[PDB]
């Protein structure tokens, strides 16, 4: 049975856009803009986009489209780098362990929004402490913050990551709904997902447009917009902003998960993935910018309502999404409709990205093992059920701490290392000239010198710098006033290293399993598997300087 192809170009484009434009653009990007001075974050973010993220989005799409394999088996062109595919699959699994819990939060809030009196508008609820107060009629004791932290997370019942408690049953039911939706959107291949993304990948844009248009008019929104567009240039001398920008670029665009490779693996050969990558990157960046505009307008609005400064209303984590925006909504007229549309948009943003992240794992491992390829429904069930079981940790009472650890270490330094290894393996060992020849065979034109330079020198160099500084400039993990114990940081670094070490481990395994002399093993490892008949003939390009001097 030959590999099937997307029913339409719109199927592929909507899948790629739904995965790329994700909950990150609304939950992670605006908080990173506030956390890093506002407009100072945008300069590293745009720079990293241009020089690493667009180039590597294009590289992943072209690799998948030409080799027609998943992230793991795509490394038949350079057999030593299959550990990179395994690492990106593992990163995708790690990220889905908590991304679906965020989707479950969105679903819980949506079900809570089916009321004329939103539960986060006032105190007097079973989840409210005796300190609850509405400052617009200290911020942690507001109706919305207390709702999020006690009636949803039940975080008040957890002292820390050492005492996380048992899974919350309402959040467990919402997670069950999310995983069932994912399974039935993924169990029959990419056709069902490509048709499903027609609404999930399009509704968020209308919702976000209305949110932006309304927020820009709210009183005090101008102060938030000014803070958003204010550039603190001394913050660019800190490595934290650059690490955050690079990690956000690769977490939000979707490079380093194996999703783009898996999606392009179902493309027709002549599909223009260059323009697809350009369009998806531009849409992701404009969505991030518009979501940040709306979030900061709401920050200014709430700072005006509270008669406080914008830095006294912003909250770490998913606070800007689940405390600030719900509070502003509750302050509006027709607040029920605003809440319903906001959380439907959040669900639509998260669901297609979870589908893409799970498709990365399913496609990669089914291409790696054909038994899994035949049993698509059973393997999809296995992936979804494993994600559910390991996401149970993030719906516990102290599940926010596990979620913070995961969102810090699953796709932080690890994803940057994975994309760096992708770029190196494709542009140095396989050959940037060979990759350009492949792209010419698909598209008739070779990628411009800008893209080749980014693939071989610029993106690898910036990625290496960001990885090294992220390791060097790591700060102990914290959530609000809670300081994670020293062993939580070691556990998080172990989670990151778990995916990072698959690359050296696979290189060692491939070298040892291969039979022959040292040079024969090296040639087999760096030679494409379909060309392994040349190792005997001793015609390895990588053993000559012209291969390595390809600009």
């Amino acid at each position, epitope marked *: *049975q*030959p*590999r*099937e*192809t*997307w*029913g*339409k*170009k719109i199927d592929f484009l909507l899948s790629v856009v739904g995965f790329a434009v994700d909950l990150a653009n609304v939950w992670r990007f605006p908080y990173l803009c506030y956390k890093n001075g506002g407009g100072a974050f945008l300069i590293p973010y745009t720079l990293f986009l241009i020089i690493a993220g667009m180039p590597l989005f294009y590289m992943e799409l072209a690799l998948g489209q030409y080799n*027609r394999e998943g992230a793991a088996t795509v490394w038949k062109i350079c057999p030593f780098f299959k550990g990179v595919g395994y690492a990106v699959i593992l990163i995708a699994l790690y990220v889905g362990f908590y991304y679906n819990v965020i989707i479950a939060w969105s679903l819980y809030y949506l079900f809570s929004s089916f009321t004329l009196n939103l539960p986060w508008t006032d105190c007097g609820h079973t989840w409210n402490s005796p300190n609850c107060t509405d400052p617009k009629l200290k911020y942690k004791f507001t109706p919305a913050a207390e709702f999020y932290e006690r009636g949803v997370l039940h975080l008040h019942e957890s002292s820390g990551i050492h005492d996380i408690g048992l899974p919350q049953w309402q959040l467990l039911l919402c997670l069950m709904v999310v995983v069932i939706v994912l399974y039935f959107s993924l169990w029959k291949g990419v056709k069902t997902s490509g048709k499903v993304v027609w609404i999930t990948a399009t509704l968020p844009y209308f919702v976000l447009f209305v949110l932006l248009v309304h927020g820009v008019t709210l009183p005090g929104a101008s102060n938030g917009i000014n803070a958003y567009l204010h550039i603190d240039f001394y913050r660019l001398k800190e490595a934290t902003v650059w690490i955050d920008a690079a990690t956000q670029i690769f977490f939000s665009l979707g490079a380093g998960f194996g999703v783009l490779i898996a999606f392009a693996s*179902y493309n*027709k*050969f*002549d599909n223009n993935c260059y323009r697809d990558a350009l369009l998806t990157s531009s849409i992701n960046c404009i969505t991030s910018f518009v979501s940040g505009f709306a979030i900061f307008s709401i920050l200014g609005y709430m700072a005006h309502e509270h008669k406080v400064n914008i830095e006294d209303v912003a909250t770490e984590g998913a606070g800007l999404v689940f405390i600030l925006y719900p509070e502003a909504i509750s302050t509006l007229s027709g607040s029920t409709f605003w809440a319903v549309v906001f959380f439907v948009m959040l669900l639509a943003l998260g669901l297609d990205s979870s589908m893409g992240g799970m498709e990365a794992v399913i496609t990669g491992l089914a291409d790696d093992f054909q038994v899994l390829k035949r049993h698509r429904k059973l393997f999809t069930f296995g992936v979804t059920f494993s994600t559910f079981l390991l996401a149970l940790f993030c719906i516990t009472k102290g599940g926010i701490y596990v979620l913070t650890l995961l969102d810090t270490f699953a796709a932080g330094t690890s994803i940057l290392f994975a994309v760096l290894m992708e770029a190196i393996g494709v542009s140095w060992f396989y050959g940037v000239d060979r990759f350009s*020849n492949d792209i*010419q*065979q698909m*598209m*008739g034109f070779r990628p411009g010198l800008y893209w080749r330079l980014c693939w071989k020198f610029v993106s690898p160099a910036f990625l290496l710098f960001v990885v090294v500084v992220s390791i060097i400039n790591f700060k102990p993990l914290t959530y609000d006033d809670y300081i994670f114990p020293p062993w939580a940081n070691w556990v998080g670094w172990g989670i990151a290293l778990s995916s990072m070490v698959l690359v050296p481990i696979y290189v060692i395994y491939k070298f040892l399993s291969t039979q022959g002399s040292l040079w024969e093993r090296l040639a087999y490892g760096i030679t494409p598997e379909n*060309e392994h008949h040349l190792v005997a003939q001793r015609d390895i390009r990588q053993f000559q300087l012209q291969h390595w001097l390809a600009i």
Partner: nanobody
Amino acid sequence: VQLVESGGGLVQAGGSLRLSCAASGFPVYQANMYWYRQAKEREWVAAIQSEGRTIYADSVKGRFTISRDNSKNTVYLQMNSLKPEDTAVYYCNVKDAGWASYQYDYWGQGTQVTVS
């Protein structure tokens, strides 16, 4: 899905040769039809793609001309101004039949071309 190549033969340098690729089991007029040659490794020669766009390898551009007949389900490669370096076994390949199809990557048996 089957590809049967023909038209190969011994030709003089600077001559012309028209290879045919009789296709079965799929319509070539929606298909990504590629020509390869193995003198060395199989090197992509030309492609007439799902929407009729013709692309050529730099080694054959301006000399070879790929075309497809919709009535006969045949893909043609008009190789002109042939050189001794064009001597190889030319393979006709169908990457896929476009969108809503399967990635066949089916290859023909090859057709020898010898440029004296």
